[PDB]
Design a binder for these strands. Structure first.
Length: 282
DNA sequence: CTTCAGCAGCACGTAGGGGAGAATTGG
RNA sequence: CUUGCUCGGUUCGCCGAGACUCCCCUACGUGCUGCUGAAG
DNA sequence: CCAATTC
């Protein structure tokens, strides 16, 4: 299941202010640090995750979605136990080392020697020692998936979305002295607005018109709008188009129905202004 | 003006926890 | 092969050669900064 | 349709 990247183009308000991000971070800040006998009492239903949000003092910000709540609760409590799992596995290896030295101990016939003490992940106050930090990932789920852009349905915005089904489209003077060795083989076709062509390096003298490349990248945008609640993330499927193009899956035959068909559960990373997409099973 | 000594890191490997859906279905 | 990353050519118009299992977290290191205690 | 259920 190889990954792919999409650069977020448009959004209403920053990802970190989304109810999904807020509720995730709250759940993690509450769970993270809890005595081993507290996580038992506080450790898939509308009813279950409507008393869990009352027994625990984790407020919900207007986000009651089973597909949107269970995820956080599945990851958090698996991390809290992988932290204990690191200590437990190291202790298991320590006990294996004790067994290894004991084997030779019976062969020598001497009484067993003293063994080093073990460790835990909790200190004396009952709280966790290696407290895991807050993952900022805003995971997306089935009912809120990458949909193409249709200006009739989605909110007005300067963009231009192609029809669900149509084979997607397949300055730049290439001057005469540039044509004795133009690449006859198959490779990428960048464009005039590509930023690899305008980066500031000493052998270059026309560097980085600030808005021109950005505008000509946005003109030909393939937008996809994941909409969670009243918030929307308008994406750029070109990064997804490249991945299927260079990985030998579709050769100039796809639309914004088959492209997205190649997982509708993206992982959004708010800090980088990026989106991550998975593939199918093969 | 030197060895070492123990914490931290702008920086780097490691090193090991975790994560990366889609099929009914009711109302 | 439309975004995006790395590195090169230039007449400054884009051209060429590539990477593409990624994100978070805990800790620790080696070179350099910082606080100290030994020896003339 | 679309937010809830399985596994």
């Amino acid at each position: 299941c190889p990954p792919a990247k999409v650069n977020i183009l448009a959004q209403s308000r920053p990802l970190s202010e989304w109810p999904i991000n807020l509720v995730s971070k709250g759940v993690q800040e509450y769970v993270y640090g809890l005595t081993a006998a507290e996580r038992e009492a506080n450790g898939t239903s509308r009813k279950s995750l409507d008393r869990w949000f009352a027994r625990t003092g984790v407020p919900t910000h207007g986000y009651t979605t089973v597909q949107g709540l269970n995820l956080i609760l599945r990851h958090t409590f698996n991390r809290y136990d992988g932290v204990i799992k690191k200590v437990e596995t190291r202790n298991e290896k320590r006990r294996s080392k004790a067994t290894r030295i004991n084997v030779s101990r019976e062969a020598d016939g001497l009484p067993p020697i003293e063994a080093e003490p073990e460790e835990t992940a909790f200190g004396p106050d009952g709280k966790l020692k290696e407290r895991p930090g807050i993952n900022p990932s805003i995971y997306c789920y089935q009912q809120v998936s990458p949909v193409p852009y249709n200006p009739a349905k989605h909110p007005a915005l300067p963009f231009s979305g192609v029809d669900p089904g149509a084979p997607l489209p397949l300055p730049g003077y290439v001057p005469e002295w540039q044509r004795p060795h133009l690449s006859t083989k198959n490779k990428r076709i960048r464009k005039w607005y590509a930023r690899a062509n305008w980066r500031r390096k000493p052998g270059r003298k026309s560097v980085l018109d600030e808005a021109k490349l950005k505008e000509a990248a946005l003109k030909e945008a393939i937008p996809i709008i994941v909409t969670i609640g009243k918030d929307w993330i308008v994406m750029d499927a070109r990064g997804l188009l490249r991945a299927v193009y260079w990985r030998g899956i579709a050769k100039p035959g796809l639309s914004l129905k088959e492209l997205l068909g190649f997982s509708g559960d993206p992982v959004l990373d708010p800090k980088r202004g990026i989106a991550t997409f998975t593939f199918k099973l093969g």
